[PDB]
Amino acid sequence: ICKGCLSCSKDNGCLRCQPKLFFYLRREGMRQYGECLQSCPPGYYGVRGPDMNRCSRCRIENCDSCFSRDFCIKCKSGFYSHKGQCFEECPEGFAPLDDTMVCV
């Protein structure tokens, strides 16, 4: 009924996931239902909490895959990571490397 849960609520769904899974929120009714996932969806990154791990929307431009809120571990194929972000051309002060895609 709630899957991979440790406390399950008729209406808001799972409120505490089993240690290995990722809490994911979504709409059921106007309410927010909570799930417990194997890994996160797409556009979502893992977040190791002290109580529980949870999924969170990646909000970096041109980022294939976040690592934290402000830090992209993978920029869109063909894009220059710099200071967490992913950029078209390196900004004033910086330039790429010997085939890295990283501003200096």
Numbering used by the authors: 39 to 142
Q: Mind quoting what the paper says about this structure?
A:
Rspo (R-spondin, also roof plate-specific spondin) proteins are evolutionarily conserved from fish to humans and have well-documented roles in a broad range of developmental and physiological processes resulting from enhancement of canonical and non-canonical Wnt signalling. ZNRF3/RNF43 specifically targets these Wnt receptors for ubiquitination and turnover, hence reducing Wnt signalling responses. Here we report a molecular level analysis of the ZNRF3/RNF43 ectodomain structure and its interactions with Rspo proteins.
Sequence analyses suggest a putative domain structure for the Rspo proteins comprising two furin-like cysteine-rich regions (Fu domains) plus a thrombospondin type 1 repeat domain3. We therefore engineered constructs to express the region spanning the two Fu domains of Rspo2 proteins from several species. In the crystal structure of the isolated RspoFu1–Fu2 protein the two Fu domains arrange sequentially to form a ladder-like structure of β-hairpins. Each Fu domain comprises three β-hairpins rigidified by four disulphide bridges, similar to the cysteine-rich regions found in members of the epidermal growth factor receptor family. The connection between the Fu domains shows considerable rotational freedom, allowing a 50°–60° variation in the relative interdomain orientation. The N terminal of the two domains, Fu1, is distinguished by the extension of the second β-hairpin. This prominent loop presents a solvent exposed methionine (M68) at its tip, which we term the ‘Met-finger’.
